[PDB]
Amino acid sequence: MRVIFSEDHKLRNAKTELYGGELVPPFEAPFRAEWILAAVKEAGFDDVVAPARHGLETVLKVHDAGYLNFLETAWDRWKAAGYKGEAIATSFPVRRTSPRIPTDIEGQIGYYCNAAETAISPGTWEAALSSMASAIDGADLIAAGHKAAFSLCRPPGHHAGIDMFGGYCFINNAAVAAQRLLDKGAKKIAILDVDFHHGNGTQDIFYERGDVFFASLHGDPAEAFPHFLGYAEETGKGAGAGTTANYPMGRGTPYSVWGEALTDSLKRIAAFGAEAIVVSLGVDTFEQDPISFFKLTSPDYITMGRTIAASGVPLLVVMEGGYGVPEIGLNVANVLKGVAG
Amino acid sequence: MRVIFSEDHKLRNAKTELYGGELVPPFEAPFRAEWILAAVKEAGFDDVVAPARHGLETVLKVHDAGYLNFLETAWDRWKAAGYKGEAIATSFPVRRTSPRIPTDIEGQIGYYCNAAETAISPGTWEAALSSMASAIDGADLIAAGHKAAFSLCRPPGHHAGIDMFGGYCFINNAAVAAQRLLDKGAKKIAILDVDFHHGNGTQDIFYERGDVFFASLHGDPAEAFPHFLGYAEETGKGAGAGTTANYPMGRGTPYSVWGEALTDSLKRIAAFGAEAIVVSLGVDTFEQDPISFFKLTSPDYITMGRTIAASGVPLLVVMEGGYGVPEIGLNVANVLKGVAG
Ligand SMILES: NCCCNCCCCCC(O)(O)C(F)(F)F
Ligand SMILES: NCCCNCCCCCC(O)(O)C(F)(F)F
Ligand SMILES: [K+]
Ligand SMILES: [K+]
Ligand code: NA
Ligand code: NA
Ligand SMILES: [Zn+2]
Ligand SMILES: [Zn+2]
Numbered sequence: 001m002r003v004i005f006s007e008d009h010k011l012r013n014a015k016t017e018l019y020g021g022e023l024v025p026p027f028e029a030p031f032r033a034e035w036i037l038a039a040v041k042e043a044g045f046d047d048v049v050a051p052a053r054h055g056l057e058t059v060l061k062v063h064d065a066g067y068l069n070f071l072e073t074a075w076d077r078w079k080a081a082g083y084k085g086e087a088i089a090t091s092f093p094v095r096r097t098s099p100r101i102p103t104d105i106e107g108q109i110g111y112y113c114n115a116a117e118t119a120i121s122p123g124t125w126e127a128a129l130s131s132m133a134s135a136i137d138g139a140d141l142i143a144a145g146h147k148a149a150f151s152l153c154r155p156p157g158h159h160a161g162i163d164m165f166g167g168y169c170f171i172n173n174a175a176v177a178a179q180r181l182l183d184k185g186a187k188k189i190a191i192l193d194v195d196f197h198h199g200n201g202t203q204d205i206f207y208e209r210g211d212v213f214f215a216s217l218h219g220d221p222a223e224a225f226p227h228f229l230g231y232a233e234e235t236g237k238g239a240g241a242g243t244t245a246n247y248p249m250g251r252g253t254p255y256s257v258w259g260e261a262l263t264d265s266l267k268r269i270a271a272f273g274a275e276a277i278v279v280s281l282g283v284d285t286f287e288q289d290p291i292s293f294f295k296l297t298s299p300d301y302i303t304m305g306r307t308i309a310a311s312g313v314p315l316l317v318v319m320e321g322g323y324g325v326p327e328i329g330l331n332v333a334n335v336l337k338g339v340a341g
Numbered sequence: 342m343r344v345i346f347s348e349d350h351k352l353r354n355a356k357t358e359l360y361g362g363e364l365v366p367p368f369e370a371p372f373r374a375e376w377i378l379a380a381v382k383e384a385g386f387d388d389v390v391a392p393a394r395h396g397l398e399t400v401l402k403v404h405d406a407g408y409l410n411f412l413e414t415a416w417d418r419w420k421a422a423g424y425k426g427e428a429i430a431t432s433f434p435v436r437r438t439s440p441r442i443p444t445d446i447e448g449q450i451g452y453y454c455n456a457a458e459t460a461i462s463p464g465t466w467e468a469a470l471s472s473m474a475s476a477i478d479g480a481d482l483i484a485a486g487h488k489a490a491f492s493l494c495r496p497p498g499h500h501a502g503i504d505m506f507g508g509y510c511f512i513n514n515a516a517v518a519a520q521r522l523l524d525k526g527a528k529k530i531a532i533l534d535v536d537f538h539h540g541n542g543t544q545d546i547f548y549e550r551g552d553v554f555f556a557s558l559h560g561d562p563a564e565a566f567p568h569f570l571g572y573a574e575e576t577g578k579g580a581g582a583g584t585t586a587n588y589p590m591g592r593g594t595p596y597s598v599w600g601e602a603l604t605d606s607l608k609r610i611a612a613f614g615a616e617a618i619v620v621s622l623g624v625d626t627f628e629q630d631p632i633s634f635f636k637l638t639s640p641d642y643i644t645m646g647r648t649i650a651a652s653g654v655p656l657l658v659v660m661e662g663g664y665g666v667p668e669i670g671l672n673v674a675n676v677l678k679g680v681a682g
Contacts, residue, residue, distance in 0.1 A: 018431055019431075020423075020426050021419075021425065084361050088362045092455065093435055093436065098570050104564040107562075110568060116433070164436065222444045223443065223444055227443050227447065228432065228451075229437075
């Protein structure tokens with residue numbers, strides 16, 4: 001398959017992340033892309049191509065325009081306000097707040113944020129657009145008839161909702177890819193989110209839409225980030241009724257249990273009639289992952305890729321999370337081996 | 342008038358505040374209380390007494406029990422979870438989230454928080470209870486017939502809502518005082534919030550209650566913290582219809598304009614028939630305040646106190662904000678001079 005990857009991911013090189021009450025170097029840092037790219041090449045996936053640039057036509061169909069305008073100028077406005085650190089939200093529109101949008105940068109950064117650990121830094125918008133472009137070009141390969149492709153997205157995307165950034169995400173790459181496939185002629189698309197964390201952003205985008213089915217396997221939100229979405233009872237509303245399937249799982253979950261949820265999610269997707277599946281691939285389900293509590297082993301990733309590809313419909317694999325250890329590369333490459341085998 | 346003050350405020354001595362993307366020493370620091378106490382004594386208000394301790398009977402009528410239980414153990418749980426900094430929320434229940442309460446400390450601190458600049462530190466709960474006690478004893482003096490009293494509360498209270506902390510606030514001292522006056526026999530009480538910031542916490546507590554009228558003068562939430570409440574259109578709901586009056590004002594507002602809103606707020610309170618007024622007094626309206634944009638001068642505080650006391654109804658003055666310079670003490674003492682003169 002083709003691997004789509006932009007060196008412009010490096011424009012997102014934030015100095016800080018709010019973690020454990022401290023400002024520390026971020027878990028989601030450029031070395032992740034370096035390690036993943038090297039490992040996929042080592043596994044024989046060396047058809048690596050930069051994405052063509054894209055404008056906003058596709059992304060405007062999944063994200064709010066005000067939100068995207070906010071991301072475009074957030075850094076400039078923060079710096080102009082005289083703040084000395086990176087741009088980090090403080091006040092949030094929580095229970096029983098006004099729905100009004102503030103006008104100043106501090107109010108707006110909170111309005112448009114779901115998670116304060118994520119700082120906006122110079123280059124973030126440009127990096128996010130390059131990552132979106134990798135997802136779009138991946139989608140275009142699937143629309144053109146390829147049965148597999150890998151979009152090596154960074155920054156990741158699945159915590160970005162209709163109008164909010166957080167969890168290291170700004171533009172929901174998988175959502176944009178799904179939209180691109182619909183725009184190219186698909187009538188029904190699924191997104192299968194196997195990252196350890198719930199894709200709350202993706203769920204938000206498609207919750208009331210019947211053209212996209214969203215399935216997520218993830219740490220129970222009662223005790224895992226993102227904390228406020230991802231319960232099994234959330235199945236969709238309005239036109240999207242019955243098109244969200246959440247599989248929350250608990251501490252220590254191994255493949256023998258996680259794979260049963262995978263099987264079920266694929267049954268759901270097949271019954272929905274997806275013409276293609278966008279896989280939001282995080283490898284933070286790994287037993288060594290520093291911020292996560294599942295216990296998948298490196299061989300399990302091959303099984304996972306094979307099982308998802310046995311759906312018999314085309315796959316776009318879109319990179320999400322997976323942290324800390326160089327094995328993040330091996331684990332992603334193993335999913336691709338399972339898909340390609 | 343009696344000044345009620347607890348030395349246990351010092352148990353809240355947090356090391357960090359998230360401001361401008363940095364962790365800096367908090368603005369809401371123990372020295373504020375020292376500066377204020379010294380200035381009130383200097384102005385002749387030297388009848389200073391410690392509050393009697395109180396349990397939870399009054400506060401349970403204005404704050405949610407789960408919220409108070411959370412505050413009682415938050416620090417211990419944060420430390421037990423292995424985090425190295427103070428306890429600072431990251432993920433928040435913002436637009437289109439599940440209403441469910443997480444079980445873990447990271448989920449719960451976000452569930453129960455409206456603003457991430459405020460860290461929970463060891464001693465915070467104990468300090469908050471002492472500050473609440475000062476408000477309760479102040480209220481009891483008014484209930485017993487005194488026409489004025491000053492509760493030198495620290496930490497402050499007016500950003501704490503039914504089930505949320507933030508803005509340096511944990512227990513809404515003014516709300517507890519109002520409830521105490523109702524419990525002692527009043528049928529109608531007003532809270533007049535003259536701190537620069539909107540009392541979003543106080544508004545939340547009484548929004549659907551007809552027994553308390555809430556008026557606030559504050560920086561416009563379109564461009565001032567707390568950003569997500571405080572618009573003039575918010576007038577109450579259900580049983581509380583017509584009992585919230587917000588007076589948002591803009592950059593550079595001087596007393597000649599601010600005092601017009603004060604006059605109107607007092608006219609509203611009089612028409613409501615308040616039997617006493619709890620004044621949420623912050624002096625961050627001062628022209629030198631480091632985080633605020635109003636332009637009151639020190640003499641204006643005497644005018645303010647005189648005008649509020651000309652209501653002819655008993656006042657409990659409850660300390661809120663005011664930062665940076667020892668003149669916060671002069672400014673508070675000047676309000677008391679206007680009340681007592
Ligand atoms: N104590 C737990 C702290 C959790 N902090 C935020 C973790 C964000 C994870 C992001 C991701 O892996 O889901 C993505 F795919 F988006 F990259
Ligand atoms: N760039 C603006 C940063 C604002 N940060 C939070 C300010 C909280 C003010 C607290 C207060 O003064 O309203 C209280 F009365 F509660 F103490
Ligand atoms: K997931
Ligand atoms: K106010
Ligand atoms: Na849907
Ligand atoms: Na009310
Ligand atoms: Zn993840
Ligand atoms: Zn204030």
